[PDB]
Amino acid sequence: QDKAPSHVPFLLIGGGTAAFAAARSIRARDPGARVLIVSEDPELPYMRPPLSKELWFSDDPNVTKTLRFKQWNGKERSIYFQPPSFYVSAQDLPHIENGGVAVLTGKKVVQLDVRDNMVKLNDGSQITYEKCLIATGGTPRSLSAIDRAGAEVKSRTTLFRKIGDFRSLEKISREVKSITIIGEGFLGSELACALGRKARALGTEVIQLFPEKGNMGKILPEYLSNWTMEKVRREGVKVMPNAIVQSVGVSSGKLLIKLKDGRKVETDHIVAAVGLEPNVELAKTGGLEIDSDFGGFRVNAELQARSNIWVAGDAACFYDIKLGRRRVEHHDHAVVSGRLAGENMTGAAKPYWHQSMFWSDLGPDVGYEAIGLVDSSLPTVGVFAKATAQDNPKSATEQSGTGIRSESETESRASEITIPPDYGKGVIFYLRDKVVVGIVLWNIFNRMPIARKIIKDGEQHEDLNEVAKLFNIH
Numbered sequence: 001q002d003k004a005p006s007h008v009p010f011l012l013i014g015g016g017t018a019a020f021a022a023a024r025s026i027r028a029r030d031p032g033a034r035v036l037i038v039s040e041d042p043e044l045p046y047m048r049p050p051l052s053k054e055l056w057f058s059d060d061p062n063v064t065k066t067l068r069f070k071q072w073n074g075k076e077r078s079i080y081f082q083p084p085s086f087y088v089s090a091q092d093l094p095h096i097e098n099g100g101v102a103v104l105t106g107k108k109v110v111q112l113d114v115r116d117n118m119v120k121l122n123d124g125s126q127i128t129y130e131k132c133l134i135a136t137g138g139t140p141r142s143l144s145a146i147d148r149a150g151a152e153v154k155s156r157t158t159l160f161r162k163i164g165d166f167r168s169l170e171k172i173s174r175e176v177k178s179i180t181i182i183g184e185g186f187l188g189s190e191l192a193c194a195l196g197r198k199a200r201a202l203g204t205e206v207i208q209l210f211p212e213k214g215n216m217g218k219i220l221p222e223y224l225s226n227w228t229m230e231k232v233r234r235e236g237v238k239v240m241p242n243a244i245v246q247s248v249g250v251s252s253g254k255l256l257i258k259l260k261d262g263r264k265v266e267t268d269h270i271v272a273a274v275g276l277e278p279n280v281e282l283a284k285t286g287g288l289e290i291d292s293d294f295g296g297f298r299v300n301a302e303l304q305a306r307s308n309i310w311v312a313g314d315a316a317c318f319y320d321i322k323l324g325r326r327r328v329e330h331h332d333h334a335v336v337s338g339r340l341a342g343e344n345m346t347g348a349a350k351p352y353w354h355q356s357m358f359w360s361d362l363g364p365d366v367g368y369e370a371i372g373l374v375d376s377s378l379p380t381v382g383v384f385a386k387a388t389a390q391d392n393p394k395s396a397t398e399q400s401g402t403g404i405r406s407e408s409e410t411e412s413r414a415s416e417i418t419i420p421p422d423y424g425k426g427v428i429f430y431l432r433d434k435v436v437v438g439i440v441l442w443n444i445f446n447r448m449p450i451a452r453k454i455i456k457d458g459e460q461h462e463d464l465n466e467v468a469k470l471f472n473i474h
């Protein structure tokens with residue numbers, strides 16, 4: 001029943017967010033389409049954001065089993081994109097009436113033969129295709145100190161990516177006295193807050209350490225990076241900025257992290273959250289171009305790597321309408337680019353002109369959104385205000401019904417943006433020559449279309465305090 005077919009019209013390599021969106025797209029445009037997703041994981045397609053967020057905010061002990069979570073508004077949602085009975089079997093796929101979408105789980109595509117329109121799986125199965133999407137996502141970066149420390153340290157280090165890592169780390173959280181997160185980024189900070197909340201109830205320790213001066217310091221300016229660090233500290237987490245890891249070893253049963261400044265940190269387990277590299281292993285056999293500067297498969301405006309091979313999601317190095325070649329790690333991009341790839345695979349020939357958004361929540365009470373070029377080394381103007389009662393992720397989730405912020409923001413850009421005639425929220429403009437090239441929104445929701453319009457228009461702005469009024473910052 002899960003026997004690989006010899007041929008499929010639409011082959012999707014990888015079974016994450018972009019592949020699911022593509023399958024949906026293909027099927028909407030061609031209701032008899034036969035679509036095979038090949039997924040190296042055991043699980044059917046699922047979304048990632050809850051893995052560092054709402055799944056940790058449950059008191060139900062069978063969360064690890066069901067992977068149902070409660071949104072910030074109390075409403076239950078499955079991590080899976082659709083119920084498992086909505087897929088057809090791989091065996092049935094070639095000739096079942098009206099086609100369908102099948103998933104081969106626990107199978108990895110290891111070779112791509114582009115001239116022959118064929119892939120080979122790790123078990124030796126050969127599948128030919130008519131149209132192919134590469135949607136392989138990324139592979140977490142390791143830390144060189146872990147790489148050089150050997151197998152014992154490696155075995156006590158988690159690179160947090162999938163359902164399996166949620167399960168392993170949630171178990172570690174219940175069982176050990178101290179966990180250290182290495183990395184200042186959004187994922188590391190979400191995990192710090194999640195683990196920190198668990199630890200408060202157990203009386204245990206969570207450390208977050210990183211070389212930057214504060215959380216998300218590569219992206220946020222000092223004021224908001226510092227504020228974030230304080231929020232994380234308010235959760236009980238021990239945050240160690242300006243920490244440069246020299247080495248990691250085991251000392252009488254504990255991990256011992258040595259920092260350049262002379263500090264030594266003893267802990268039971270390490271989570272490394274220091275980014276990823278696109279999964280481009282198939283470029284070798286496929287002879288496909290990869291981007292040496294940004295990583296990822298190079299694609300054209302229509303997301304094509306070849307006449308009949310598209311790329312979407314984290315794996316794609318696309319041409320951003322404003323910024324040129326880039327890759328992102330955004331749920332929004334994976335949805336929109338996967339949907340577009342599917343449309344183009346069914347004859348749309350439409351260009352990828354979407355401006356991808358990003359969001360992060362540090363619990364129900366603090367959220368961020370970002371769009372465009374967001375880099376703390378650029379000149380910035382931050383405009384802040386006291387928060388109102390609605391300016392938090394929980395309220396945004398209550399109003400919209402969803403915690404997936406890309407859905408509630410919409411994909412749209414505003415049609416017009418006429419300026420109308422402690423701090424807890426604000427807007428940060430990232431600049432080039434008075435032109436806004438990126439925006440971070442701090443506890444401001446339902447305004448992403450305005451931010452997109454500002455950046456798309458690319459006008460010079462004489463007074464960004466006036467522009468901030470569009471974000472209800474006065």
Ligand SMILES: Cc1cc2nc3c(=O)[nH]c(=O)nc-3n(C[C@H](O)[C@H](O)[C@H](O)COP(=O)(O)OP(=O)(O)OC[C@H]3O[C@@H](n4cnc5c(N)ncnc54)[C@H](O)[C@@H]3O)c2cc1C
Pocket residue numbers: 013014015016017018019038039040041047048049050051052107108109110135136137138160161162187279312313314315328329330331332334357358359360361
């Ligand atoms: C824990 C976590 C939290 C996140 N939170 C947010 C958030 O709040 N907001 C946001 O904007 N973004 C968030 N992201 C980013 C977002 O989830 C990703 O951008 C999105 O998952 C990318 O989708 P994708 O389809 O490109 O890749 P993935 O969803 O990673 O799917 C790729 C799949 O392909 C499989 N695969 C790879 N190679 C092969 C092969 N050769 N054969 C078969 N299978 C293969 C992989 O195992 C994987 O299952 C988060 C990511 C993670 C990990």
